[PDB]
């Protein structure tokens, strides 16, 4: 709702940042293996920015990755439905 979809995103972004590191360590070559950049990666992912500096290589990494897209893209296609209503209405008044 007002800021409710916002929160659920941030669960997913953290949660996902965390499991990303858990899944990706042990895979020889993974780029995505410290909690900080895992967190930036999951924003990169939920917003579908696509800079492409980080991504997963393991299977469970990609699995986490899909949850973030689904859960974040639905978050964001609802957090951005809402910065669009409140702020456009404020500037409409």
């Amino acid at each position, epitope marked *: 709702a007002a800021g409710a979809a916002t929160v659920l995103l941030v669960i997913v972004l953290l949660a996902g940042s*965390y499991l990303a*590191v*858990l899944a990706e*360590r042990g895979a*020889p070559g993974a780029q995505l*293996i*410290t*909690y*900080p950049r895992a967190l930036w990666w999951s924003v990169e992912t939920a917003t579908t920015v696509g800079y492409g500096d980080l991504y997963p290589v393991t299977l469970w990494g990609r699995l986490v990755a899909v949850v973030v897209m689904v859960a974040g893209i639905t978050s964001f296609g609802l957090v951005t439905a809402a910065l669009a209503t409140w702020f456009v209405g404020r500037e409409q008044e």
Partner: antibody
Amino acid sequence: VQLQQPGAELVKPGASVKLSCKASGYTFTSDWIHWVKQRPGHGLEWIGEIIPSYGRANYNEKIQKKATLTADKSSSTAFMQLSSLTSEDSAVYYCARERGDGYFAVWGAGTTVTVSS
Amino acid sequence: DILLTQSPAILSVSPGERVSFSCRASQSIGTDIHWYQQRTNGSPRLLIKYASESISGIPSRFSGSGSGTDFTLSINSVESEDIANYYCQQSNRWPFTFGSGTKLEIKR
């Protein structure tokens, strides 16, 4: 002393040995514990890391995988099971505490292992 | 397994003078290099983290430069308490890896 591990172990060849590391200070969710091996007159060889709160561990690909890592969530001590040892396995064994951000902030004083009959 | 290459293997230097250790990596690793000092009989001791950032409790002598594949630790003046082995360590791809190390020696 943030990471605190025994001084020396003596092992007969072929035997196993379990190495400890009690870790006062903070006991974070996200903390990893690593194990670096320093043969005499050599540099540091990473060996394996473990996240104790969550269980899972990861070992060095390219060395003969002798060891297996374990943890005790409520005792803040973590273990490393070196198994069937030779003399090539005698070295100092450090544990380090990596916050999750990829450097070893903290290092145990290290456990000198000697494999001889 | 990213290959960190510290040359030279040993480093002479007359005291009070700047000194630099190079750690070159087998591929670009951004800035995810971190330096450790390890004296005789002691465990290693994080000196510099993420190439440039400094650790609290470390002399201001120590300074860290570099990015990509070429990295450098530096001591703007040396004293005899710095004789030790110095390692680099990359955290940019799994597994984390260590440099071969450089020993500091002092012409006196």
